[PDB]
């Protein structure tokens, strides 16, 4: 069990930006945290790749 005051712990979040070379991605949310979604096509593997990060 943990008993803490509001000032005891600190969380910080930063949403990554979608760069110039990436096809424009969406932006989702998780517990009020803004998540950067991104997709890229692998011609070599003949398939799509998605990343959702923060």
């Amino acid at each position: 069990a943990y008993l803490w005051h509001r000032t005891a712990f600190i969380l910080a979040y930063r949403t990554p930006v979608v760069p110039e070379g990436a096809k424009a991605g969406a932006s989702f949310s998780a517990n009020g945290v803004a998540l950067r979604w991104l997709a890229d096509y692998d011609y070599s593997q003949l398939g799509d790749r998605t990343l959702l990060d923060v």
Binding site: S44, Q45, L46, G47
Partner: protein, 55 residues
């Protein structure tokens, strides 16, 4: 090309674009040559167009 669906190897064969060429040339010289003496031209030839040029 063709490949099987759901094939674990995802390599694709590169198709290639190859133009070709040949060549056309001038090769021969077709001619008709005539020679006349002054005597033939003065006395023998009566109509130059019908006797010389048209043949």
């Amino acid at each position: 090309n063709r490949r099987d669906l759901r094939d674990p190897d995802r390599t694709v064969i590169a198709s290639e674009l190859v133009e070709h060429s040949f060549g056309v040339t001038l090769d021969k010289h077709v001619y008709a040559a005539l020679k006349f003496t002054d005597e033939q031209r003065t006395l023998d030839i009566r109509d130059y167009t019908k006797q010389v040029l048209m043949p």
